[model samples]
Target: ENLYFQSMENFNNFYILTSKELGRGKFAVVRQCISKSTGQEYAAKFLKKRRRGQDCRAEILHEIAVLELAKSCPRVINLHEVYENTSEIILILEYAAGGEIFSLCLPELAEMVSENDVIRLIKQILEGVYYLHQNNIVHLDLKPQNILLSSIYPLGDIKIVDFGMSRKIGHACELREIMGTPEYLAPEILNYDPITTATDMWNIGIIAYMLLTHTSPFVGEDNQETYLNISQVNVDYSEETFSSVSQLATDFIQSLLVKNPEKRPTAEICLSHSWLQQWDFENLFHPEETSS
Candidate 1:
């Protein structure tokens, strides 16, 4: 309801879409677009208004609302503008040049990612998640693919994107939905229980594990197997997988991966954990000494 929609104006009047595709989903496609006035670049997300002949405008509207609510957050991706046409709703979003953090999870790149690098990135991600939680908004889907880096070389700030699965939890409303990716899904989510901020904390644990070891902590051969593993809170932290990792890192992950959501540390609390605290102090006074 806080969103202001532009009339059926020609999108070409404001920006020019390039052939370069940024990303593609089932019902949306993101492409690089340039503004006509300042020639600035942005990612244009083209969302289909109808899917399988069903009117899905309300869902897109909710996504826009979430993005608008998070516009002021530096750690979250910015929404520039909105344009609507007959069949599509195009959202102009901040362009993250470094792309998704998923690349860092790749085996080739994970070997080069030090624990310090993981700490820096996860801290930024937690900051953004904390901001959203402060506003009672829960990003149901939080994974490497949804976390983007502003630049590649020397690394860059984290820009959390993809609010399509996000939801605002009000005091009177109980939000419960079976959603999120298999590997990152919290136990409550797998159980179809009510969603809470702790749900996201669980995902943070999974992300930290992946960033540290280039492998999923609870993944199995198939979706059913994966679901069972997650529901049972079955996680493997074998010496072979985390031989070089520190105890503090595993302790942090274990704190969040608990079977009970109430036991998981909130984002704000996680920011104070020793694993992240080390980097916080080093970066505070010795900023010049830290390097990407």
Candidate 2:
């Protein structure tokens, strides 16, 4: 019944899939693909229709629906086409040549990211999250790995990818799920509390901290200890950890790392914080032309 679903056409008919794998998950694989007609390149994600011998077509359909809803948001990755077959569904998405933001965290490459760059990147991320929140979508997974850049040489704009862990909120009942990475997970998530937009904000705080200090705030020896640290909000702001980081950055992180979800600022509010407001985002990045 959904208009997003295309005919059961063979994927190879429209695009030439390459052997180069971009990434992979438990049930899906992403590869570089080229369109037959336009010769344009895209990242094709092939998702298995079934998981654990059960028909999980609905999950893929939900992801497509989310992508459709977010099609107009420039900060989020664009979904160009969708195709389904007997055992899998293929999503042709905008190719982010720069790859994940996680690379910036590596010791050898960490020096490449400056404070201004962090602010600009965080602002764009907030803008994307704001757009998603306005549409009632919460990206449960907001780690650096899910954040992609358009290009690296000039340090391109952020293109958020992966909606598999996303959920449309404001539903009939309270939504709660035990999902997300250990270091980036909010306290409410580990407590099995009701999920809210603030959940994503918590992840943003962690991301900002990581970008600034090049270290995880609540990481521990294992998942159990990590969950414990998150529950207690055991963040270390020691001189060794954040001595070089600005006070504004720490304040921004503190605003979101609160144990109470209600206490955390929404994405829109975070966008206006002084830390992110220090730079002129409007002029730094050229505005995309309004849709015709």
Candidate 3:
């Protein structure tokens, strides 16, 4: 009932979603909805005013601008529409029927994903990221939770969504305040340093490691403790850790996670590495897609 009937009422009023529930957290709830005009099913991500002291207004608008800027990147999740009224901010987005991407890291999801499939998916991600870098946007928060899959394809054929923390990068804004899921926070973020597009590459490297080994390269009992650990470069991956993955993949991660921002790879370079080349990318997206 959440989505079957969207309230035409002003943006502030609550619009029930099609599916009763999906995911929930401090700032938002995701539910299925049908676009009254398009006749298309979508996931309506609902955001309610937080009682906490945090500024949800600017953050919500930030999400809006980021998604608007990403309209051209097909690999990024498509936001069909956004509306606001008195009590709520409604985001009409494409539904990923395949389910949340964290599923891919599970033993059961591992049973479904092949190495090549992962490569295909990651390449698509890189492609989407490449577009973002081209547009001068940094996805400060890059993690599996932000990724969603196509119901017809795979965990690899992902749509990189959730840019709540993303920001524009350039001479005017060389450094960004450190804010991200600790597990994927780059070393620069830990140092309370200014951020750059390279931040995305760092997380991408961690994600790559996780995909190949079926495990997070870094973890801890709590987020704060975890951030402290990453700042120390507490990583240990040996032949035993990911014996099945290629050395090229190792080289790629090494180049990406360098502690010095001066040394991190550009999004373009990360997308073109030999390890990435090992995957069958010849048929990733439809070639004619650019015309659209």
Candidate 4:
């Protein structure tokens, strides 16, 4: 499935890539795209082939391989096609109208979503991570910015996105790297230990804590302090912070935020927690009429 040399005639022939930007970063820029034939919309993420006079072909292909490996995951973002040219490689991905979960963490939208709905969303994220773990892939970055919703109403469907920092575990030598956002990075990264599935679980634990309390459990006033908090596992599950949160919810996060990676629960094991089991996850994620 290495379609590295393959090139489409002209991307404009099939889809109209707009100038409107959805996301922007050093490696790539995401823009809105429209399928001319079906009138459907998509997100086109274009990665420059060269950056600062250095070729990035290998990095681009590695990300494609990861996406291809996860193509069958229902909760992962679907990749429709890949187009290449002299300057860049384009990834045509599913258009998530609901955007990132970062929006929900904001005060304006935080209260609009119910606690039950938040639980359902976190379960979906875990499901996606479960699938990734099954395939020996560690989504190094599992923050709210990487999780998306398919629609806006009824809370829509979950779709995990952005795999540029993801790593497929093949050997012990492959695990050394300081990747992912400072706020979500696991303590193992700071300790220079081999990364594992438990690394992702730590981030999921942070995500769950944020969804429940709308606060970053380990993020301090500065990056240094944030890293220090994560390294120390100094999580605040106090009465003032999670007073309204259920005991089961607090227990669920505590089970994953441990400083010892081996002590953390796997994605599969986390699914059976009392908090997630409180509601029928299957029904809540995919109900007959409501995705409640």
Candidate 5:
């Protein structure tokens, strides 16, 4: 799983791996490549040869730099090796097998993961978020897609992938950038205000809602309409939203979705909340997702 990069004519020494992997998003085709020197598997993100040296390159590099600086944070992904030759920038990273947490969410359009299991997933995610905050990194995107599987999860798998949107924010500085997935964006992001660690908490609240309910609390069939509703906090909920769900879990989402970032709980405060604490997450992650 070790990746090594060398320079050639038009092609650099990068694309020389036996393990073929695909990029995270439909927009890019980055793959899971391995370094021949160290047997390490890294996610090799790339673009077209013609598209090389563009903002795409800068973006991937920025993501790499962010990951490198945040390496001390065990919850964040690690970038192993990187190089650029004539055509493109090469990135190597830790290979996570559990895949994105999204996979386990809506396994079938007909049925969603049970509320109990979703709670377990939320617990793990909150723990990861807590870890990131302690290290001064804001995981701007807190959706299930970014969560990967690890050996630590019951039935032996838990992973969170793709840190391209993560930003560092612990130097007594204010994060004023508007980034992260729109579905999970915080209220401040809609205002184009400076984002903060609490921004992530806001997203976590949304994610928590999604997991337990398998529905977008703020989603609409139309994009503009969706934004309009989310922009103004017009989320939809009913008895079905949390029929058998706990009051504490409902309260967790409520606390996180406050319009004022100052009102949202910090990652630390979130971890101690009754909703997250109530779930015996360590043992129930593998509960049967559906009736089958």
Candidate 6:
């Protein structure tokens, strides 16, 4: 039994979740939770009592420990509490009203938010990524689905979510198998090479490209063809490809998508790139309105 959590407690004591589920997955489902005393709204992620073969219990504990390490990151979802019943485990997290940043990858949504807002959002994401890397953690799964927005209107704040695929940088558990979404997976991941912080950087580059242009950098007609393209590090940055994007943005993407992991910039270094620095990214962390 893990000491990080209390013995199975009654879940109803604190939260009454809505019938409307927010998101669903193979072993878990998220829903809107209402606090009993404060009436504050939160997102309740519930893991199933059991799975067919894997140890759901241990995985849940691992996820909790990772969350604990990343708790101090402002851009990450806040884990208010954890609870477990005879058949399920519940994690109470901050409700992201704006939902995933998936739509922003489309031209229509991109038209609504300005280039500056996109820069701001990317800076915020890098902030969280920097924190995780500083703590020796690598988010194996970095995609549009995992990047969330706190508010819908006025271009809400970014909140990186889903630690299920994240692993410690130097952990003993060797990552041999390929993991993460097809298009976002790094070349190292496909070749079964040593996964490092650079792996996450590659995904960030893919995200950056998608944010700037509605198309993916490495996607192909089918899965097999996509894998071949990834192995070859095939990419397109033609005049038409990045015609609407700034040269700085294209340069930033180029720096991260290199085949050699050593060539990719670290998260901290990426923060200083011309594209991110030219804008008022520092203001994102320190607002004059909040200053004395």
- Deviation of model 4 at 215, angstroms: 1.0
User: What overall lDDT, based on C-alpha atoms, would model 2 receive against the true structure?
Assistant: 0.85
How far residue 96's Cα lies from its native spot in candidate 1, in Å, is: 0.5
| Per-model TM-score on C-alpha atoms | 0.89, 0.90, 0.83, 0.90, 0.74, 0.89
Which is the better candidate, 3 or 4, if ranked by lDDT?
A: 4
What is the TM-score (0 to 1) of candidate 3? 0.83
lDDT of 5 by residue, 1-292 (tens): 1223444332333345555565444334567665455556666655333342344555565666667766765566666666555455555557775566665646252154555566566666777677767767776777777777653244234444566567767322234244355567677777766658987888778777766676777767776776787778887658966786688888989898888889888878877887655535477555657757
Q: Name the regions of candidate 6 deviating beyond 4 angstroms.
A: 1-9, 170-177, 279-292
lDDT of 3 by residue, 1-292 (tens): 0222234464324334564576887778888876555556778777764436554666787777888888878788888777654445778887777766666776666767777776777788889889998988888778877877886353436888778677777423333345466688888777667758887888888877777777776688888678766887677678787778777778877887677877888878877777767624475655655875
Q: Pull out the clashing pairs in model 4.
A: none
Instruction: Report the error of model 4 at residue 191, Å.
Output: 1.0
All candidates: CA RMSD (Å):
4.7, 5.6, 6.4, 5.1, 7.7, 4.6
| Weakest ten-residue segment in model 3 by summed lDDT | 1-10
Per-residue lDDT, model 3, residue 69, is 80
Which runs of model 4 end up more than 4 angstroms from their true locations?
A: 1-9, 170-176, 279-292
Tens-digit per-residue lDDT, 64-109, candidate 6: 8888888899888999988877667788899998998888888778
lDDT of each prediction vs. the true structure?
A: 0.85, 0.85, 0.72, 0.85, 0.64, 0.82
* Lowest lDDT block of 10, candidate 1: 170-179
Compose the digit string of candidate 4's lDDT tens values, residues 1-292: 2446447666878889777789998879999999999989999998998887877888888888889888898799999989987788999999998898877877677768887888889889998999999989998888899999998676887899988777765334243256456888888788777768898899888888888888889989999999999989998988999887889989999999999999999999999887887645476364479645
Candidate 2 Cα misplacement greater than 4 A, ranges = 1-10, 170-176, 279-292
lDDT of 1: 0.85
Worst-scoring 10-residue span by lDDT in model 6: 1-10
